[PDB]
Amino acid sequence: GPVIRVAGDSTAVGEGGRWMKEMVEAWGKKTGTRVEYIDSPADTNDRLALYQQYWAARSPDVDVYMIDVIWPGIVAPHALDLKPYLTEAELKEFFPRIVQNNTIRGKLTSLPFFTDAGILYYRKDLLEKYGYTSPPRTWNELEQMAERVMEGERRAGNRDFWGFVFQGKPYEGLTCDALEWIYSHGGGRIVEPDGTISVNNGRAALALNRAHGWVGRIAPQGVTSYAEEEARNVWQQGNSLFMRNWPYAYALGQAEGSPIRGKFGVTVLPKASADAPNAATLGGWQLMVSAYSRYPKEAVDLVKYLASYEVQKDNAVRLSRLPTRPALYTDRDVLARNPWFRDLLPVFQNAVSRPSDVAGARYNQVSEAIWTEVHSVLTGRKKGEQAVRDLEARIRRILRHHHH
């Protein structure tokens, strides 16, 4: 009978690829359906380029794709509309915000699978060791704490020790980190939901200059090449006071044999001042049935299974990845394993989106401009003031004649 083939999460990032292949295998066994799993590059933007090859070919060789929250506007032509396959009641079990994200010109491109938001990881043993009782609320405090702890730990002989790791590589992850920087300085959303390209302002410039100020000082020089896992590795080996990253890093840091098991917490990222907004970039992945699948009924069944309560529960318990079902945030087992889901839920719900809705199908071009201009500040090649002006100009060109 049919072979349902799934291009899912990458085995190069955390345990998501292995766990998803397992879930797909379980559905295959449960229903007596053959399945195959197709692996992917680590970085989202490289995965998009891979999958676009299949879509351009109208290839039947993948039935189900795991797609980024930033993609629906890009991928819609290649998605089977799921709206007819779900009742209103079923669809309301997901966060409406993510359903809406995934709905393009009325077409439900994909089911919400797990959400995501940027957060601050901090070593609580080290904060306590150096007389700090709370994680930093301001970027200035993060700097001051990082400098003092780094000076201490280096003096004690850990030459591998740094104050802060983050995603500074030129790729989509840096757009994520930069939106957080910019938004948390009161510099806006880069491109606002109404289409206004707002990034050329003094607050956004300062946010970028501040980030430059970290590189080779409180963060490694090599941070300009770090994606999620490079940052996680330094952090997880015990060599960073702080890390910006997504929720998945929590379960991995708690695993038996982690050098940092039991020594960290998470909180909202810091911000420039008390009146700035909290910044957490909205991420997360969705489940799309291919418009080119020869087996839409079966593929929809698998996608509904993957997006079910019990699979999302397993995702949350074992991989600390965020449900797209509000009911799971009151599940006793989810909360007992991840108590930080409770206090950060409103951070997750208030996560700031990248400009994928307003840029639509041109989002990837916009983001490439953002990360390349941000990266030029991190490297010390441009100041934030020039970079934001240049970025405005590039985004104006990219979005000229695009209306949302």
Ligand SMILES: OC[C@H]1O[C@H](OC[C@H]2O[C@@](O)(CO)[C@@H](O)[C@@H]2O)[C@H](O)[C@@H](O)[C@@H]1O
């Ligand atoms: O790099 C930006 C990208 O980050 C996140 O997806 C990448 C991987 O992160 C996970 O560990 C989940 O946090 C894996 O499951 C992902 O493959 C984020 O969710 C995206 O929205 C974002 O574009």
